[PDB]
Design a protein around this ligand. Structure first.
Ligand SMILES: [K+]
Ligand SMILES: [K+]
Ligand SMILES: [K+]
Ligand SMILES: [K+]
Ligand SMILES: [K+]
Ligand SMILES: [K+]
Ligand SMILES: [Mg+2]
Ligand SMILES: [Mg+2]
Ligand SMILES: [Mg+2]
Ligand SMILES: [Mg+2]
Ligand SMILES: [Mg+2]
Ligand SMILES: [Mg+2]
Ligand SMILES: [Mg+2]
Ligand SMILES: [Mg+2]
Ligand SMILES: [Mg+2]
Ligand code: NA
Ligand code: NA
Ligand code: NA
Ligand code: NA
Ligand code: NA
Ligand code: NA
Ligand code: NA
Lengths: 122, 211, 222, 88, 71, 33, 85, 104, 129
RNA sequence: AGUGUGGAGAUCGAAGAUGAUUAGAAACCAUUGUAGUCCACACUGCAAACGAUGACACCCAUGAAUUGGGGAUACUUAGUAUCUUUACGGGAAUAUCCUCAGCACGCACGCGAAAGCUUUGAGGUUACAGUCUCAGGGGGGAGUACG
RNA sequence: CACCAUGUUCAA
């Protein structure tokens, strides 16, 4: 039974959030960083935090981890989603021809505006 | 709500608006009918899928827009979503219209727990689906908050006041209904003109895989 | 010493809402008991302890005893409030139930029996209020009648501001938790009955959180 | 003109409650489900003006699931929504 | 449930007459079995002659001896 | 256990005990008659 | 927004669905037809829900068959629905 | 005391029928009504996987092309016999209402 | 079977008002039913109502506003004198300020306020408020 | 279940018998077994004879089904197929929509002490009145005694 | 699926 209690897990999640650039994939160099960026009465807890910070870093290299918020990663990935195609997708469907079923065309014919130009049956 | 006091036809659905609705399949139901949404259904296709009236969809869409545009101070109109398919839509809608939003799990007590430190008191609530956003609608029933909801053919209409009959399942359909709603609210203000088409693309309203 | 956590409480402290009737008109819930402290004139609001009794939960080692306290608040001028709370201590339960009494404050409609002379003295119509099996029926009475009610309903009807009434009770009236709430529910029903006096159409009004929306934004902002 | 009055003419009522616009139901002070929806008035062009038209719905109508149908009836009555499309 | 006819007074009179006998207080005051069994014969007080003294053990949970006499 | 507290023996067996008591009472009156 | 139902003036769709007694005003469900003898070409008026087997007056030929509902007309006959009124 | 089941434990509504003839329980023979009894239709292999392999190895007719026969029994149980044999268990009050219309 | 037609009609109207309906169909109809409805109409408790002829006991469609709390029939008719008007408002009416007791009198079907002014007793038909 | 008279008597089986178990155990278990169980005629009229819910009538929100009979293939009217087919056969069953009648399921008001009921009310009730009828009045004694 | 009966009177 070697579960990291919530005190170790919360503190190791705080360290990764604040010192992600300084951390690494090894326990011993990370434990050195934990030694001076943390205040704790116990060396054992600092040892368990260093073990779980390294576990978080190995998890972060494979993908995003719930409970960790890194602003540099978030903004960089947000800019990726902000990019738009040269032409709109709804336009491309219209220029390619909108296909409707029988019931939809009956409703369109009953409309005051009539059937739109680039709309055909299926 | 296309009818105005002067009798002008300015808010009525044009041919461009109908094309956008038809391309994104916003008129497609769920084959499962509901008593509250029976009126909004024009008919049933041969394969069983229900077809949403487009006049009734547009009348309800403008009514919601005129209600949202009537809120002098934004950010007390909350746009909630739980499907994760409308999470980017409500984020983009809030970017232009200027409203509050919350995607993902609705934390219970957000509208009722006054000491939560994450406690908000909106004036209007907008949700993507009454069934999946039942938590937000339930709290709004305790604090006098009207609800505007994008409702499908099988939606339950308890505690929702303005129901937009729409296809709130597909990625492209949800993006268009929030794009059309955002465009109309901006048009109802002085932000953009009706003649010039909107420069913002509906693709920014679509949901993207996190990968 | 009061930092409002709600838009209504912020408006009350900023003196933008000055009466309980604006809250009553727009059906807004009251989440802070300090809203009633401001909006009721000093010395008008009175409190009284109706009932205190212990409730027990059987546990593995003996049992646990807590105390349920009933408080009645009211200005004797058309406002009544009933609130019940449980605490591990009698004093703690008493304090919590005074807060709950102010939070559950309702308006009471007072009318006439015969001629509409002077201030209203009785309820406008027959009303009943039910809690559990207990139902309390209040009947309008002529002037000079007084409150013909049991001592527990009589105290609530005195705090509500009615002078003459005929009261009948049914069920287990010795269950004073239900008897206190049954009287309170009957008085709440007075403003839900549509009388030909209220048939006329009234013009729309602006919600206080709508009218002062720009003021409330800058409070949270700064 | 609305409320309980005296023989001297004074208004006896403490306050005049709102009435639901669909059921003519007095909206009580402690129901907390009744809403007030204000629809913006639009000028000849697409831009709104300062005026709005507000509807009051009792909280029991929303719990039944009939507040959507009631608002449809009211907005058509007040000339806000169009009941059907015109002739092509 | 009961009858509600305009000319149904005979049924309502018999209903109360038959069902009043289920009232133990009413039946006791309208029958002679209570007075015939009552030693005092329907009177408040009555004189007597003492026969013997008896001590009655009080019912539980009480434990005592109550002084009593046969009269 | 399908029933509530009887406060006595089983009602079916009390009914049978009463049933036999009536039989022996009508036999004692028969022999005197 | 759609059209609200009117109790005194029901629409065609709802009135057509209704049972003849459940209708707003009670009315019959049957009619009369002009059926011609297959071997005679002589026309007789036949009830739509006839339960007695109708014979051609000259032919003496069965023109219909009883059923639990509408009468089944003979093969080779021609019929036209007579106006109700 | 209180009504435990709206079903009353049987598949007999109030105005459906009066009497349903009882069956003998599969295990102990207790006479229980046919709609109340806990009925299970089982299809059992005559031999287990290892025993079938040995017998089918010695069988000219049985193998991959021709399957071995099975046992088909409709078993109806008394309520006491079904609970003890664990073909059916007591359930939480909320979970009591869920029914399965097909073998799962 | 149906024994009182007015009692059935008033239960149908009262049920529709509690349910918030704008219209109600009444079947069957009589002269007493129509005369009762006209008394409520002249006091503003119901809107326009329409009688449909079906060559039988007709049907009535009543347009309902939200002003009617409860209407009902008192059975049996319970003949009422001019001195019993006060005792009937004390029993069945919510207040002395509003609500009407409808009686059938030799001068016609009218509410208790009109009947008292005409100085006529009658048989109590019902109430509405 | 029981009774009478004739049958019948395979299985099961009150009473009874034997063997176990047990401190005891003509109890549960085992092997048997009489009356019964089955039939005809005649009695009896005692059930958790239950939905522990009297009968008749009105109104009453929703979705998926089910059994029988039919019909169709504040708007002036809104489709649809599948399989078998030399004689209880101008057939049978399906699909879609509607409708009357029946047994119901998951259910919006409302009701209820609650459990729960809910067009199948236990709803439309202190805002108490559609009609008729039966029963109840703290627990026992006692459904006993007498007639 | 061998056998497994009981707990003096009031009051914490
Ligand atoms: K149950
Ligand atoms: K049947
Ligand atoms: K039975
Ligand atoms: K045997
Ligand atoms: K007897
Ligand atoms: K002993
Ligand atoms: Mg048990
Ligand atoms: Mg039990
Ligand atoms: Mg009992
Ligand atoms: Mg025999
Ligand atoms: Mg044996
Ligand atoms: Mg019996
Ligand atoms: Mg019974
Ligand atoms: Mg009564
Ligand atoms: Mg008794
Ligand atoms: Na003692
Ligand atoms: Na003693
Ligand atoms: Na069962
Ligand atoms: Na033993
Ligand atoms: Na039963
Ligand atoms: Na059938
Ligand atoms: Na003692």
């Amino acid at each position: 039974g070697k579960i990291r209690t919530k005190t170790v897990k919360r503190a190791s999640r705080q360290v990764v959030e604040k010192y992600y650039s300084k951390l690494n994939f090894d326990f011993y160099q990370n434990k050195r960083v934990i030694m001076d960026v943390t205040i704790a009465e116990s060396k054992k807890l600092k040892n368990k935090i260093a073990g779980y910070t390294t576990h978080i870093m190995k998890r972060l290299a494979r993908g995003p981890v719930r409970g960790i918020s890194l602003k540099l990663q978030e903004e960089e990935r947000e800019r990726r989603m902000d990019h738009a195609p040269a032409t709109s997708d709804v336009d491309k469907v219209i220029q390619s021809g909108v296909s409707v079923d029988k019931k939809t065309m009956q409703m369109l014919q009953r409309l005051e505006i009539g059937v739109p130009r680039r709309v055909k049956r299926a | 709500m296309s009818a105005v006091e002067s009798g002008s036809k300015v808010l009525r659905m044009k041919e461009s608006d109908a094309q956008k609705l038809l391309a994104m399949r916003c008129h497609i139901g769920t084959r499962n009918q509901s008593s509250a949404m029976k009126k909004y259904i024009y008919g049933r296709t041969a394969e069983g899928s229900h077809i949403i009236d487009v006049h009734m969809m547009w009348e309800k869409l403008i009514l919601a827009a005129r209600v949202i545009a009537a809120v002098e101070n934004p950010k007390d109109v909350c746009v909630c979503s739980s499907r994760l398919y409308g999470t980017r839509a409500i984020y983009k809608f809030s970017q232009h219209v200027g409203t509050s939003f919350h995607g993902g799990r609705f934390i219970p007590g957000t509208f009722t727990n006054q000491i939560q430190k994450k406690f908000v008191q909106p004036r209007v609530l907008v949700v993507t689906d009454p069934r999946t956003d039942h938590q937000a609608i339930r709290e709004a029933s305790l604090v006098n908050i009207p609800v505007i909801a994008l409702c499908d053919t099988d939606a339950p209409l308890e505690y929702v006041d303005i129901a937009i009959p729409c296809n709130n399942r597909g990625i492209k359909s949800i993006g268009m209904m929030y794009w059309l709603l955002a465009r109309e609210v901006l048009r109802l203000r002085g932000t953009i003109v009706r003649s010039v088409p909107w420069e913002e693309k509906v693709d920014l309203f679509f949901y993207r895989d996190p990968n | 010493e009061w930092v409002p956590c709600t838009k209504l409480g912020r408006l009350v402290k900023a003196q933008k809402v000055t009466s309980l009737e604006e809250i009553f008109l727009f059906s807004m819930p009251i989440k802070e008991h300090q809203i009633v402290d401001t909006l009721i004139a000093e010395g008008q609001l009175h409190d009284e302890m109706m009932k205190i009794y212990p409730v027990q939960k059987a546990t593995s080692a003996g049992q646990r005893t807590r105390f349920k306290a009933f408080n009645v608040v009211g200005d004797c001028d058309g406002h009544i409030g009933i609130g019940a709370r449980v605490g591990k201590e009698v004093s703690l339960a008493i304090r919590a139930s005074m807060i709950a009494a102010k939070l559950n404050i309702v308006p009471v409609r007072r009318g006439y029996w015969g001629n509409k002379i002077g201030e209203p003295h009785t309820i406008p119509m027959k009303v009943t209020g039910k809690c559990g099996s207990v139902a309390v029926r209040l009947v309008p009475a002529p002037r000079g009648t007084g409150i013909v009610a049991a001592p527990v309903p009589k105290k609530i009807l005195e705090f509500a501001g009615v002078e003459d009434v005929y009261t009948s009770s049914r069920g287990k009236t010795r269950t004073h938790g239900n008897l206190i709430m049954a009287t309170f529910y009957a008085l709440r029903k007075t403003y839900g009955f549509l009388t030909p006096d209220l048939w006329a159409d009234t013009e729309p009004s602006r919600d206080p959180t709508d009218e002062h929306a720009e003021l409330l934004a800058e409070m949270t902002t700064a | 003109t609305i409320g309980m009055f005296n023989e001297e003419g004074e208004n006896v009522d403490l306050y005049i409650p709102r009435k639901c616009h669909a059921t003519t139901t007095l909206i009580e002070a402690h129901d907390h489900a009744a809403v007030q929806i204000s629809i913006a008035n639009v000028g000849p062009n697409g831009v709104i003006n300062g005026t709005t038209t507000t509807l009051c719905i009792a909280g029991y109508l929303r719990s039944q699931g009939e507040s959507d149908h009631a608002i449809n009836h009211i907005t058509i009555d007040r000339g806000i929504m169009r009941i059907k499309t015109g002739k092509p | 449930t009961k009858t509600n006819g305009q000319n149904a007074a005979r049924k309502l009179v018999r209903l109360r007459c038959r069902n009043r006998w289920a009232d133990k207080g009413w039946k006791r005051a309208h029958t002679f079995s209570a007075r015939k069994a009552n030693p005092f014969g329907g009177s408040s007080h009555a004189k007597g002659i003492v026969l013997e003294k008896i001590g009655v053990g009080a019912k539980q949970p009480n434990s005592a001896i109550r002084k009593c006499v046969r009269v | 256990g399908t029933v509530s507290r009887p406060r006595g023996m089983r009602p079916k067996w009390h009914k049978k005990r009463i049933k036999r008591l009536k039989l022996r009472r009508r036999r004692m009156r028969q022999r005197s008659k | 927004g759609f059209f609200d139902a009117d109790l005194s003036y029901p629409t065609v769709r709802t009135e057509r669905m209704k049972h003849k007694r459940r209708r707003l005003v009670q009315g019959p469900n049957s009619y009369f037809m002009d059926v011609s003898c297959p071997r005679c070409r002589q026309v007789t008026v036949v009830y739509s829900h006839a339960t007695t087997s109708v014979e051609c007056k000259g032919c003496s030929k069965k023109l219909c068959r009883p059923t639990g509902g509408k009468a089944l007309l003979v093969e080779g006959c021609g019929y036209r629905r007579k106006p109700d009124h | 005391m209180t009504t435990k089941r709206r079903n009353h434990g049987r598949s007999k509504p109030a105005h459906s029928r009066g009497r349903v003839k009882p069956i003998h329980c599969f295990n102990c023979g207790r006479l229980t009504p046919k709609d109340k009894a806990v009925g299970r239709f089982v299809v059992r292999r005559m031999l287990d996987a290892a025993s079938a392999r040995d017998v089918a190895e010695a069988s000219p007719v049985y193998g991959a092309n021709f399957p071995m026969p099975r046992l088909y029994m409709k078993q109806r149980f008394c309520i006491a016999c079904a609970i003890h044999s664990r073909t059916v268990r007591a359930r939480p009050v909320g979970n009591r209402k869920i029914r399965y219309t097909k073998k799962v | 079977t149906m024994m009182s037609v007015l009692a059935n009609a008033l239960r149908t109207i009262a049920s529709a008002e509690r349910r918030g309906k704008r219209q109600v169909l009444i079947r069957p109809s009589s002269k007493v039913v129509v005369k009762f409805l006209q008394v409520m109409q002249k006091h503003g408790y119901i809107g326009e109502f329409e009688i449909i002829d079906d060559h039988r006991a007709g049907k009535i469609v009543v347009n309902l506003n939200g002003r009617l709390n409860k209407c009902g029939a008192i059975c049996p008719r319970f003949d009422c004198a001019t001195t019993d008007y006060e005792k009937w408002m004390k029993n069945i009416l919510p207040s002395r300020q509003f609500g009407f007791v409808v009686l059938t009198t030799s001068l016609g079907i009218m509410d208790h306020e009109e009947a008292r002014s005409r100085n006529t007793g009658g048989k109590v038909l019902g109430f509405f408020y």
